[PDB]
Amino acid sequence: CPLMVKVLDAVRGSPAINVAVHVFRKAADDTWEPFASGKTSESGELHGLTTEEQFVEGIYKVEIDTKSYWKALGISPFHEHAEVVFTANDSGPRRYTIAALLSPYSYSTTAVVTN
Amino acid sequence: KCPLMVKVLDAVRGSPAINVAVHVFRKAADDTWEPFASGKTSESGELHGLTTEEQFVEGIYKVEIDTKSYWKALGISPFHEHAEVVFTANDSGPRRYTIAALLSPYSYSTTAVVTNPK
Amino acid sequence: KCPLMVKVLDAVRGSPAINVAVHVFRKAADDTWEPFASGKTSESGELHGLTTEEQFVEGIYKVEIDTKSYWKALGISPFHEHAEVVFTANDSGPRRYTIAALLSPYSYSTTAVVTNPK
Amino acid sequence: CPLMVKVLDAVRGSPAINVAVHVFRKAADDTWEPFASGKTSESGELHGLTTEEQFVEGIYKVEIDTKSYWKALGISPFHEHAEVVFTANDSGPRRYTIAALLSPYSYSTTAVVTN
Ligand SMILES: *C(C1=C([O])C(Br)=C([O])C(Br)=[C]1)=[C@@]1(*)O(*)C2(*)(*)(*)(*)=[C]C([O])=C(*)(*)(*)[C@](*)(O(*)*)=C2(*)(*)C1(*)(*)(*)=[O@](*)(*)*
Numbered sequence: 001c002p003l004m005v006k007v008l009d010a011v012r013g014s015p016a017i018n019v020a021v022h023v024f025r026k027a028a029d030d031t032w033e034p035f036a037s038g039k040t041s042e043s044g045e046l047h048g049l050t051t052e053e054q055f056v057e058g059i060y061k062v063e064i065d066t067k068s069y070w071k072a073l074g075i076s077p078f079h080e081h082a083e084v085v086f087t088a089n090d091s092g093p094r095r096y097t098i099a100a101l102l103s104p105y106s107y108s109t110t111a112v113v114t115n
Numbered sequence: 116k117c118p119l120m121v122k123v124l125d126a127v128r129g130s131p132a133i134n135v136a137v138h139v140f141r142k143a144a145d146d147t148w149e150p151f152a153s154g155k156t157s158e159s160g161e162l163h164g165l166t167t168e169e170q171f172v173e174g175i176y177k178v179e180i181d182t183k184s185y186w187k188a189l190g191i192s193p194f195h196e197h198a199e200v201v202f203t204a205n206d207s208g209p210r211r212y213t214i215a216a217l218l219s220p221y222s223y224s225t226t227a228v229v230t231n232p233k
Numbered sequence: 234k235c236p237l238m239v240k241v242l243d244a245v246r247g248s249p250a251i252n253v254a255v256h257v258f259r260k261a262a263d264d265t266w267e268p269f270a271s272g273k274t275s276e277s278g279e280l281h282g283l284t285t286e287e288q289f290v291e292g293i294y295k296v297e298i299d300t301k302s303y304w305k306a307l308g309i310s311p312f313h314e315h316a317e318v319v320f321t322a323n324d325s326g327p328r329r330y331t332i333a334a335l336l337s338p339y340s341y342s343t344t345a346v347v348t349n350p351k
Numbered sequence: 352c353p354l355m356v357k358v359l360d361a362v363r364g365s366p367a368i369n370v371a372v373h374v375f376r377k378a379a380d381d382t383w384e385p386f387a388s389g390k391t392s393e394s395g396e397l398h399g400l401t402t403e404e405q406f407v408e409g410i411y412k413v414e415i416d417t418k419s420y421w422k423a424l425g426i427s428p429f430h431e432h433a434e435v436v437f438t439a440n441d442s443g444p445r446r447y448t449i450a451a452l453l454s455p456y457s458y459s460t461t462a463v464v465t466n
């Protein structure tokens with residue numbers, strides 16, 4: 001399993017749980033096509049995602065629905081959503097982890113890439 | 116302030132990120148992204164002169180920062196293609212938006228500082 | 234710029250962190266922390282007027298930001314006691330240091346922007 | 352095991368491995384006393400640390416030796432080290448995770464606290 005996501009809440013100092021996360025593979029027409037989606041688990045993680053064989057070289061975009069996460073705590077968010085576009089390249093494609101640490105007006109993001 | 120300014124910094128190096136291409140869009144009635152403005156950052160890491168209190172109506176705006184180019188430009192292959200900020204501007208009237216991004220090759224952070232013209 | 238300024242922002246709320254107690258120390262010959270300067274942040278989130286190009290010799294300086302007080306002051310019990318920045322200043326000659334901290338109750342980030350007087 | 356640390360490198364998009372991490376319990380005299388220390392593992396984690404029974408209510412300080420981590424990649428750091436002081440209070444003391452994401456001039460930090 002090469003693609004995991006994690007969401008933290010820097011307001012509660014907990015995992016963000018039930019964050020809708022939608023992945024998109026860029027299509028030839030340089031058009032964003034749905035690839036996989038799921039809801040963050042108990043611990044703020046999502047390993048659903050993909051198959052080693054299905055995750056091929058390309059432009060991928062992880063889109064996190066944060067506004068929703070914020071609204072639901074009855075906090076007013078600045079962002080519409082968080083998104084991260086990266087290239088699944090590297091040597092040949094490996095194991096990614098896309099962490100997002102959130103706040104109403106600020107979010108961070110990181111990739112932890114390991115072989 | 117101008118209704119919109121961007122501040123880009125380098126966490127690798129300890130300085131403003133100079134000459135970073137930045138691109139602002141607005142969602143069209145259409146659900147399509149319309150070119151609103153563009154600039155490159157200056158010597159202080161800043162980008163002003165973007166829009167006007169007037170031209171800057173309510174809507175969903177998207178700031179795209181060409182992070183990729185900047186890192187490459189300096190010899191490093193960063194993780195990310197860009198950095199995008201998606202937000203709703205002027206729904207409760209005109210505000211002053213200050214979007215800052217702190218960059219590392221595999222990490223970036225963005226904050227918003229919103230304020231009242233008055 | 235002054236040789237040292239601090240910029241504190243609120244990520245919860247989308248603004249400068251106003252009236253945040255900040256405390257600067259210097260390690261004494263002694264290995265003991267000596268009171269160098271102190272201020273509270275202003276309306277813009279800033280703190281200037283701290284030292285002087287002259288009073289600000291080489292050394293290890295520690296900036297302590299009273300994060301705890303600020304959050305409590307606004308009804309939230311934050312995780313952290315303070316925020317401390319430990320660094321070596323003016324070893325390759327006088328520089329201009331800009332320390333910023335972006336705060337959340339369970340998270341804080343700090344960046345340094347260093348520059349040449351000339 | 353109530354206390355874990357994790358260190359990421361936002362320059363390499365990897366875990367920071369072999370980061371000296373030293374914990375300190377505040378003593379009555381409001382003096383910092385050694386409590387536990389260890390080196391970050393393969394994955395940037397450190398679970399050595401403490402025993403549920405030994406980790407009591409109090410002021411704790413995790414001190415990360417980052418300058419060393421940076422020097423060793425032959426990169427010049429701004430910080431002397433990263434430190435985090437917190438109170439092991441809560442309801443009654445629970446499970447902490449102190450993550451630190453680092454860069455030469457910037458570092459972030461977070462607690463993920465769960466029951
Ligand atoms: C803001 C600021 C940010 O927008 C972000 Br995303 C992070 O991570 C930090 Br830390 C700070 C300011 O930070 C600075 C730093 C300097 O040197 C000058 C400034 O004008 C600012 C900000 O406005």
Ligand SMILES: *C1=C(*)([O])[C]=[C@@]2(*)O(*)[C@](*)(=C(*)C3=C([O])C(Br)=C([O])C(Br)=[C]3)C(*)(*)(*)(=O(*)*)C2(*)(*)(*)=C1(*)(*)O(*)*
Nearest residue numbers: 099101108109110448450452459460463
């Ligand atoms: C558990 C936690 O409680 C925190 C963290 O933090 C990690 C990475 C990390 C990311 O991704 C960001 Br964007 C920031 O800002 C920081 Br600080 C730390 C983890 O992997 C992690 C776990 O597992």
